[PDB]
Design an enzyme around this catalytic site. Sequence first.
Site, PDB file in Angstrom:
ATOM      1  N   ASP A   1      -6.540  -9.735  16.993  1.00 22.65           N
ATOM      2  CA  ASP A   1      -5.891  -8.871  15.987  1.00 22.65           C
ATOM      3  C   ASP A   1      -5.873  -7.381  16.360  1.00 22.65           C
ATOM      4  O   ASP A   1      -5.610  -6.529  15.499  1.00 22.65           O
ATOM      5  CB  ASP A   1      -6.485  -9.111  14.585  1.00 22.65           C
ATOM      6  CG  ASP A   1      -7.962  -8.800  14.516  1.00 22.65           C
ATOM      7  OD1 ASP A   1      -8.500  -8.119  15.419  1.00 22.65           O
ATOM      8  OD2 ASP A   1      -8.582  -9.275  13.542  1.00 22.65           O
TER       9      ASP A   1
ATOM     10  N   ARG B   1      -4.424  -2.213  15.105  1.00 20.19           N
ATOM     11  CA  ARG B   1      -5.084  -3.304  14.427  1.00 20.19           C
ATOM     12  C   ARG B   1      -4.073  -3.906  13.469  1.00 20.19           C
ATOM     13  O   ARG B   1      -3.423  -3.200  12.705  1.00 20.19           O
ATOM     14  CB  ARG B   1      -6.251  -2.697  13.607  1.00 20.19           C
ATOM     15  CG  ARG B   1      -7.013  -3.621  12.679  1.00 20.19           C
ATOM     16  CD  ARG B   1      -7.661  -4.793  13.436  1.00 20.19           C
ATOM     17  NE  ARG B   1      -8.590  -5.572  12.635  1.00 20.19           N
ATOM     18  CZ  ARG B   1      -8.226  -6.520  11.782  1.00 20.19           C
ATOM     19  NH1 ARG B   1      -6.918  -6.824  11.602  1.00 20.19           N
ATOM     20  NH2 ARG B   1      -9.149  -7.186  11.095  1.00 20.19           N
TER      21      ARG B   1
ATOM     22  N   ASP C   1      -7.428 -11.306   9.793  1.00 14.46           N
ATOM     23  CA  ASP C   1      -8.780 -11.273  10.354  1.00 14.46           C
ATOM     24  C   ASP C   1      -8.853 -12.449  11.278  1.00 14.46           C
ATOM     25  O   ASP C   1      -8.959 -13.593  10.830  1.00 14.46           O
ATOM     26  CB  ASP C   1      -9.852 -11.382   9.250  1.00 14.46           C
ATOM     27  CG  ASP C   1     -11.259 -11.080   9.781  1.00 14.46           C
ATOM     28  OD1 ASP C   1     -11.337 -10.355  10.792  1.00 14.46           O
ATOM     29  OD2 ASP C   1     -12.242 -11.520   9.152  1.00 14.46           O
ATOM     30  N   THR C   2      -8.828 -12.158  12.574  1.00 14.33           N
ATOM     31  CA  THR C   2      -9.111 -13.228  13.541  1.00 14.33           C
ATOM     32  C   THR C   2     -10.597 -13.272  13.818  1.00 14.33           C
ATOM     33  O   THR C   2     -11.288 -12.266  13.738  1.00 14.33           O
ATOM     34  CB  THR C   2      -8.341 -12.982  14.884  1.00 14.33           C
ATOM     35  OG1 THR C   2      -8.566 -11.636  15.363  1.00 14.33           O
ATOM     36  CG2 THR C   2      -6.821 -13.119  14.682  1.00 14.33           C
TER      37      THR C   2
ATOM     38  N   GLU D   1     -13.899 -12.998  16.034  1.00 11.74           N
ATOM     39  CA  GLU D   1     -14.275 -12.268  17.267  1.00 11.74           C
ATOM     40  C   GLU D   1     -14.403 -13.250  18.425  1.00 11.74           C
ATOM     41  O   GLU D   1     -14.400 -14.475  18.241  1.00 11.74           O
ATOM     42  CB  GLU D   1     -15.593 -11.483  17.114  1.00 11.74           C
ATOM     43  CG  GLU D   1     -15.646 -10.540  15.905  1.00 11.74           C
ATOM     44  CD  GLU D   1     -14.643  -9.400  16.006  1.00 11.74           C
ATOM     45  OE1 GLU D   1     -14.471  -8.879  17.133  1.00 11.74           O
ATOM     46  OE2 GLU D   1     -14.009  -9.044  14.977  1.00 11.74           O
TER      47      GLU D   1
ATOM     48  N   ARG E   1      -7.547   3.468  14.932  1.00 10.02           N
ATOM     49  CA  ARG E   1      -6.599   2.396  15.226  1.00 10.02           C
ATOM     50  C   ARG E   1      -5.368   2.501  14.332  1.00 10.02           C
ATOM     51  O   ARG E   1      -5.493   2.733  13.128  1.00 10.02           O
ATOM     52  CB  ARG E   1      -7.279   1.011  15.040  1.00 10.02           C
ATOM     53  CG  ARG E   1      -8.464   0.848  15.943  1.00 10.02           C
ATOM     54  CD  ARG E   1      -9.137  -0.564  15.819  1.00 10.02           C
ATOM     55  NE  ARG E   1      -9.599  -0.810  14.454  1.00 10.02           N
ATOM     56  CZ  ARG E   1     -10.153  -1.932  14.021  1.00 10.02           C
ATOM     57  NH1 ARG E   1     -10.461  -2.894  14.858  1.00 10.02           N
ATOM     58  NH2 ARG E   1     -10.404  -2.073  12.708  1.00 10.02           N
TER      59      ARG E   1
HETATM   60  C1  LIG Z   1      -7.392  -4.339   8.978  1.00 13.54           C
HETATM   61  C2  LIG Z   1      -8.106  -3.064   8.497  1.00 13.54           C
HETATM   62  C3  LIG Z   1      -9.414  -2.848   8.900  1.00 13.54           C
HETATM   63  N1  LIG Z   1      -9.959  -1.660   8.401  1.00 13.54           N
HETATM   64  C4  LIG Z   1     -11.389  -1.383   8.734  1.00 13.54           C
HETATM   65  C5  LIG Z   1     -12.296  -2.098   7.678  1.00 13.54           C
HETATM   66  C6  LIG Z   1     -13.520  -2.656   8.449  1.00 13.54           C
HETATM   67  O1  LIG Z   1     -14.544  -1.604   8.498  1.00 13.54           O
HETATM   68  P1  LIG Z   1     -15.952  -2.031   9.125  1.00 13.54           P
HETATM   69  O2  LIG Z   1     -15.864  -1.773  10.676  1.00 13.54           O
HETATM   70  O3  LIG Z   1     -16.835  -0.977   8.500  1.00 13.54           O
HETATM   71  O4  LIG Z   1     -16.382  -3.486   8.823  1.00 13.54           O
HETATM   72  C7  LIG Z   1     -12.885  -2.886   9.879  1.00 13.54           C
HETATM   73  C8  LIG Z   1     -12.603  -4.350  10.184  1.00 13.54           C
HETATM   74  O5  LIG Z   1     -11.818  -4.429  11.433  1.00 13.54           O
HETATM   75  P2  LIG Z   1     -12.191  -5.535  12.450  1.00 13.54           P
HETATM   76  O6  LIG Z   1     -11.910  -6.932  11.778  1.00 13.54           O
HETATM   77  O7  LIG Z   1     -11.307  -5.230  13.619  1.00 13.54           O
HETATM   78  O8  LIG Z   1     -13.704  -5.486  12.853  1.00 13.54           O
HETATM   79  O9  LIG Z   1     -11.735  -2.004   9.947  1.00 13.54           O
HETATM   80  C9  LIG Z   1      -9.302  -0.802   7.576  1.00 13.54           C
HETATM   81  O10 LIG Z   1      -9.913   0.200   7.131  1.00 13.54           O
HETATM   82  N2  LIG Z   1      -8.006  -1.008   7.182  1.00 13.54           N
HETATM   83  C10 LIG Z   1      -7.431  -2.205   7.598  1.00 13.54           C
HETATM   84  O11 LIG Z   1      -6.287  -2.427   7.192  1.00 13.54           O
HETATM   85 CA   LIG Z   2     -11.448  -9.352  13.568  1.00 13.55          CA
END
Ligand SMILES: Cc1cn([C@H]2C[C@H](OP(=O)(O)O)[C@@H](COP(=O)(O)O)O2)c(=O)[nH]c1=O
Ligand SMILES: [Ca+2]
Length: 129
Positions: free
Chosen positions: A15, A29, A34-35, A37, A75
């Site tokens: 993702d 991103r 949510d894929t 890891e 991102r």
């Molecule tokens: C998809 C997405 C993730 N995020 C943030 C929330 C999560 O914060 P945390 O890192 O504090 O858990 C993280 C999850 O992305 P990942 O699934 O790539 O890890 O990215 C956003 O803020 N907006 C979004 O639309």
């Molecule tokens: Ca992920």
Amino acid sequence: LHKEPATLIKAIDGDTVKLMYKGQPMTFRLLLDDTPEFNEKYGPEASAFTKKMVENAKKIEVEFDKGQRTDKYGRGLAYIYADGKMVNEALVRQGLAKVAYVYKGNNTHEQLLRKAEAQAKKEKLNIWS
Ligand SMILES: Cc1cn([C@H]2C[C@H](OP(=O)(O)O)[C@@H](COP(=O)(O)O)O2)c(=O)[nH]c1=O
Ligand SMILES: [Ca+2]
């Protein structure tokens, strides 16, 4: 919403992808996905699916939603298309991502993705097996 041009720099995982957008390298991103890891079950398959989709595309496009365009890590947050097919939706339809991270203002394609998830779940695909 509107589609804008980009080119692939490098696949990363299920993702996230690195694209050149407005001439600058950026990691994107994928909104609403949510894929798993890479080190989790179906992680490698999700990475592989997104990689194939973006590497094979003649034309990549990114589509921002109405809300925040970058997350706290810098991102880009967008819907990514590969030859007109939305990667965000395809991952869900194939049971390689769950619908997730649905924040107000950035949820234009929420119902489209939830309909794909319902079908992937009915088919018991991948994550839903
Ligand atoms: C998809 C997405 C993730 N995020 C943030 C929330 C999560 O914060 P945390 O890192 O504090 O858990 C993280 C999850 O992305 P990942 O699934 O790539 O890890 O990215 C956003 O803020 N907006 C979004 O639309
Ligand atoms: Ca992920």
